[PDB]
Amino acid sequence: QKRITTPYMTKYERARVLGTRALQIAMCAPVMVELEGETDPLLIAMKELKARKIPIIIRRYLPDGSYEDWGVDELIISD
Amino acid sequence: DDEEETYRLWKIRKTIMQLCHDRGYLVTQDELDQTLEEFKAQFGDKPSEGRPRRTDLTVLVAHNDDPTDQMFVFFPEEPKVGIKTIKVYCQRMQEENITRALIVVQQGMTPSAKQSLVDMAPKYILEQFLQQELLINITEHELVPEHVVMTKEEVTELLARYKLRENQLPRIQAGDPVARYFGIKRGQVVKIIRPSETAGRYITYRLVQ
Amino acid sequence: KSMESVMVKYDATVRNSINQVVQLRYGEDGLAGESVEFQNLATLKPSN
Amino acid sequence: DREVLRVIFPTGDSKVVLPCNLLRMIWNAQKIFHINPRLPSDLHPIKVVEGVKELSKKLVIVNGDDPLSRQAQENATLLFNIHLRSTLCSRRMAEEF
Amino acid sequence: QGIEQISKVYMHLPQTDNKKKIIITEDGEFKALQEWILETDGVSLMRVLSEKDVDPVRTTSNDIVEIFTVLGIEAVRKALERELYHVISFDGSYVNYRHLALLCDTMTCRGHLMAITRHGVNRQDTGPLMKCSFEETVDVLMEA
């Protein structure tokens, strides 16, 4: 509640989320989506992003020092 | 020559009327649209050794919001305004209990009076204006966008809306010609409205510092 | 060197490292340059 | 809005840069929906006007209900709103598009 | 007779729309009147503006310092935008207006003409490490 940041996920947010989630998957993090014949952590992370199943929360820091916590599932993906 | 000098006096008077109107002091539409022939009808002589004199050209205006609050405009005849002249104006202002005065100056002013105005600034706010500067109203220039002095309440609302500090806003020097035109002091805010080729209109805020 | 830290912040304003506000909205409309393109205003030129 | 545009562009240069290409989007809609320019249309003018109004409400650059935010939004999307109204006017929609 | 600091004055009719005087006729159409505009090899903006029969609105100068000292910081912003756009578009090249606006806004942000050169950049207040990246790192750290 009381969120002023854009509801859409920025390109930088998408890039960092994909990279971090791919690193976790490569480090054997549980996969929130059902992968079929997929081994590349980046591809798995992209599948999770499309499914909106990535378990990551983005903390957007506003200029005034406050921050807003947005769920990846809550944000709107560009694709 | 006297014709050119009376044309000047008319031009400076017109610029002063526009300046007062912009500052918000009550000014009649006739005074704003006073033709050169109308000014020459009002005074009816040449400036040099004639009826229209800088002493007779002084202008008194009253603020629209507060009629009690008033502003003086003084034209000293001497080409170099002296401490005695500033003291005369100071005592005259004391008579009417008026705080704000625009001393339109000739080609120059004496440095001692330059510091005297600052010394007496708190009790009385005296602003020196060159006749050459006042010969043209710079606010009508195409480059200059629209400037509006924000009230303290409006500044508070702006800072609350953008969660900003006064330090974070863009700055405008108190010595800026437009800042002097509007008679804005340090700590005030100017809302600048300018057309935008991308958005159509854009509002900026500048803190007087 | 002058414009290194100038940035579009999460409040949609443009600010430098000092956090001073350079523009309230980037480009004065809050739009990225990639998406915009030229168009003609139909009501500007024609007569009354 | 025409007077506002006259003020904004005294030189009368109609070429402007705006996010959405309304003419190309209208052409795309015509091709997608097989709009026949010969037969009469079933698009109702007050539907056109109301859709333009609601779309203008939805195009938010500055969000907030306070007067300052509303004025900022209006100024931010002033030019695009003017172009949108001119392009999606009922007259043009019924006549050409 | 005449104004000092002005060596030569050229008078000519402009053949381009930008320098032509565009007005709105009674019918509402845009008419580009061909008017006499004169340029100078010197700069005295205050005097030239105060001169009679000289358009006090359209008359301008190509000197940013003169624009600053006469019209103000906002006029500097606008005129700097115009000059930078003129140099960019002289060869027919086009640059998005937002970049021009950002550069001019950064240059005029502090209320006074800030030179992009080190001379004006040093005026900007920045952390010690930022000033070190600029120049004079060792002495800046010494003072800090």
From Swiss-Prot, chain C:
Q: Where in the cell is it found?
A: Nucleus; Cytoplasm; Chromosome
User: Which regions form coiled coils?
Assistant: none
Q: How is it modified after translation?
A: The tandem heptapeptide repeats in the C-terminal domain (CTD) can be highly phosphorylated. The phosphorylation activates Pol II. Phosphorylation occurs mainly at residues 'Ser-2' and 'Ser-5' of the heptapeptide repeat and is mediated, at least, by CDK7 and CDK9. POLR2A associated with DNA is specifically phosphorylated at 'Ser-5' of the CTD by CDK7, promoting transcription initiation by triggering dissociation from DNA. Phosphorylated at 'Ser-2', Ser-5' and 'Ser-7' of the CTD by CDK9 (P-TEFb complex), promoting transcription elongation. Among tandem heptapeptide repeats of the C-terminal domain (CTD) some do not match the Y-S-P-T-S-P-S consensus, the seventh serine residue 'Ser-7' being replaced by a lysine. 'Lys-7' in these non-consensus heptapeptide repeats can be alternatively acetylated, methylated and dimethylated. EP300 is one of the enzyme able to acetylate 'Lys-7'. Acetylation at 'Lys-7' of non-consensus heptapeptide repeats is associated with 'Ser-2' phosphorylation and active transcription. Regulates initiation or early elongation steps of transcription specially for inducible genes.
User: Its domain of life?
Assistant: Eukaryota
Query: What function is annotated for this protein?
Result: Catalytic core component of RNA polymerase II (Pol II), a DNA-dependent RNA polymerase which synthesizes mRNA precursors and many functional non-coding RNAs using the four ribonucleoside triphosphates as substrates. Pol II-mediated transcription cycle proceeds through transcription initiation, transcription elongation and transcription termination stages. RNA-dependent RNA polymerase that catalyzes the extension of a non-coding RNA (ncRNA) at the 3'-end using the four ribonucleoside triphosphates as substrates. An internal ncRNA sequence near the 3'-end serves as a template in a single-round Pol II-mediated RNA polymerization reaction. May decrease the stability of ncRNAs that repress Pol II-mediated gene transcription.
Per the record, the domain comment is:
The C-terminal domain (CTD) serves as a platform for assembly of factors that regulate transcription initiation, elongation, termination and mRNA processing. The trigger loop allows entry of NTPs into the active site, switching between an open and closed state with each NTP addition cycle.
Disease per record: Neurodevelopmental disorder with hypotonia and variable intellectual and behavioral abnormalities: An autosomal dominant neurodevelopmental disorder characterized by profound infantile-onset hypotonia, developmental delay with poor speech, delayed walking, and impaired intellectual development. Additional variable features include feeding difficulties, dysmorphic features, and visual defects.
Q: How does it assemble?
A: Component of the RNA polymerase II (Pol II) core complex consisting of 12 subunits: a ten-subunit catalytic core composed of POLR2A/RPB1, POLR2B/RPB2, POLR2C/RPB3, POLR2I/RPB9, POLR2J/RPB11, POLR2E/RPABC1, POLR2F/RPABC2, POLR2H/RPABC3, POLR2K/RPABC4 and POLR2L/RPABC5 and a mobile stalk composed of two subunits POLR2D/RPB4 and POLR2G/RPB7, protruding from the core and functioning primarily in transcription initiation. Part of Pol II(G) complex, in which Pol II core associates with an additional subunit POLR2M; unlike conventional Pol II, Pol II(G) functions as a transcriptional repressor.
- Name the family: Belongs to the RNA polymerase beta' chain family.
What is the protein's given name? DNA-directed RNA polymerase II subunit RPB1
Instruction: Say which species the protein is native to.
Output: Homo sapiens (Human)
The residues of the intact protein that this chain contains are: 866 to 913 of 1970
